[PDB]
Design a protein around this ligand. Structure first.
Ligand SMILES: CC(=O)N[C@@H]1[C@@H](O[C@@H]2O[C@H](CO)[C@H](O)[C@H](O[C@]3(C(=O)O)C[C@H](O)[C@@H](NC(C)=O)[C@H]([C@H](O)[C@H](O)CO)O3)[C@H]2F)[C@H](O)[C@@H](CO)O[C@H]1O
Ligand code: CL
Length: 228
């Protein structure tokens, strides 16, 4: 078991989209009659005129290899660029923004570390749209620091440090490579503010318990060992 996000919200959205595609197939929508491996949930634009980011059930065979990028979701419910792009003319998808958004809201309660939630809130309050990671900055692929990152600048396939539900080291999808692209500039380093945000969270365990973090809330609170 790795100290890493299970990406449980994204897993649930993909499974719900697989059911929805199957239902649409049964209603006669031929292009949706596919194996489950062909269907994922992504947050993205759609075809021409569908210009807002919405949750949609995509046929992967209709996605482009690049980036109209598509976004996946972390276990605190933030949308982050994933591999691929929407074909604005040829996309095969079903927009299902309400059911999928509701599943994200439910998942956040289950899976989002209150320590990470506090860090994210700090960042969004100060720089709207940003989330917290301890990751790379511009043109340096070694140094990490707590920063508020514009979500568009993160890569879902790259794991970066985040706060566990014990306020300890964890890793989450949505990270930086430390490359030198314009996107690599889109962050605000906030070591003191983010650390204070994380430190301000009340423990789920008592002062007489040891917090062992888990990929779902609550963490394990084990009775502290005695002076045996
Ligand atoms: C704002 C500024 O110029 N402050 C001077 C200090 O420079 C800042 O030092 C921090 C170190 O914590 C960063 O190196 C920093 O760079 C970044 C960042 O936060 O990582 C680089 C980002 O690309 C940029 N974001 C953009 C362009 O979208 C941010 C952003 O400009 C900034 O966070 C806004 O507050 O900055 C860097 F700017 C400097 O170290 C001290 C003393 O020398 O003086 C400050 O005034
Ligand atoms: Cl996560």
């Amino acid at each position: 078991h790795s100290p890493a996000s299970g990406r449980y919200i994204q897993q649930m959205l993909d499974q719900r989209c697989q059911e929805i595609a199957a239902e649409l197939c049964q209603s006669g929508l031929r292009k949706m009659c596919v194996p489950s491996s062909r269907i994922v949930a992504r947050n993205a634009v759609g075809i021409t005129h569908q210009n807002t980011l919405q949750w949609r059930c995509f046929d992967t065979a209709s996605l482009l290899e690049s980036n109209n990028g598509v976004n996946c979701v972390d276990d605190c419910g933030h949308t982050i660029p994933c591999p691929g792009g929407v074909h604005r003319q040829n996309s095969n998808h079903a927009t299902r923004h309400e059911i999928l958004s509701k599943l994200v809201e439910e998942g956040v309660q289950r899976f989002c570390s209150p320590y990470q939630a506090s860090a994210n809130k700090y960042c969004n309050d100060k720089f709207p749209g940003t989330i917290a990671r301890r990751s790379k900055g511009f043109g340096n692929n070694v140094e990490v620091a707590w920063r508020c990152y514009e979500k568009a600048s993160l890569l879902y396939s790259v794991y970066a440090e985040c706060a566990s539900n014990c306020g300890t080291t964890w890793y989450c999808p949505g990270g930086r490579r430390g490359t030198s692209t314009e996107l690599d500039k889109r962050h605000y380093t906030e070591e003191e503010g983010i650390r204070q945000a994380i430190g301000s969270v009340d423990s789920p365990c008592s002062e007489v318990e040891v917090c062992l973090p888990k990929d779902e809330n609550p963490p394990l609170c084990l009775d502290e060992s005695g002076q045996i």
